């Protein structure tokens, strides 16, 4: 229950923490340029967001329904107690998903001439 010892045991995690701090820096730089509303600066805001956009890459597609079959709680208890991943699947990191949500919405405002709070 300590995140740092578990990341120390598997330093592939530290790679994600650095990647995520690079995205945090790029988004903050884009927001700071976007705070100035003059024409030239909004093009700097756009190139900052596009820079973080290709780093993140293709948003993963996630098939809405799958093998999971609405089982009885009585059954899921035994399937899991054979001694949860035996029956429940791992979810995608909700924070990484959030980066794609905020980047797509921010570029949407840059394309539609709103401000950052979305007001025309």
């Amino acid at each position: 229950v300590d995140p740092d010892a578990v990341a120390q045991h598997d330093p592939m995690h530290y790679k994600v923490s650095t990647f995520m701090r690079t995205l945090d820096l790029l988004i903050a730089r884009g927001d700071h340029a976007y705070r100035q509303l003059e024409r030239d600066t909004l093009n700097e805001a756009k190139m900052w967001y596009m820079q973080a956009l290709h780093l993140l890459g293709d948003k993963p597609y996630l098939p809405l329904s799958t093998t999971w079959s609405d089982p009885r709680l009585d059954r899921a208890a035994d399937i899991t107690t054979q001694n949860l991943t035996d029956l429940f699947l791992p979810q995608i990191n909700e924070v990484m998903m959030n980066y794609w949500q905020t980047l797509a919405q921010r570029v949407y405002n840059l394309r539609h001439n709103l401000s950052i709070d979305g007001q025309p």
Binding site: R39, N43, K46, M47, M50, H54, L55, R111, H112, N113
Partner: protein
Amino acid sequence: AAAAIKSRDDLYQYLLIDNQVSAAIKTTRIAEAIASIQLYVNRALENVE
């Protein structure tokens, strides 16, 4: 076809010109050319291309 351009965002990255932009936004021609060259160089340096 050597460029596997599959959608409008891919076309924006390729032609370096924003096509989904609304007509409200207006920019000078030279500034727009500067934006295209900067985007191309940024794509090259990170070896995305």
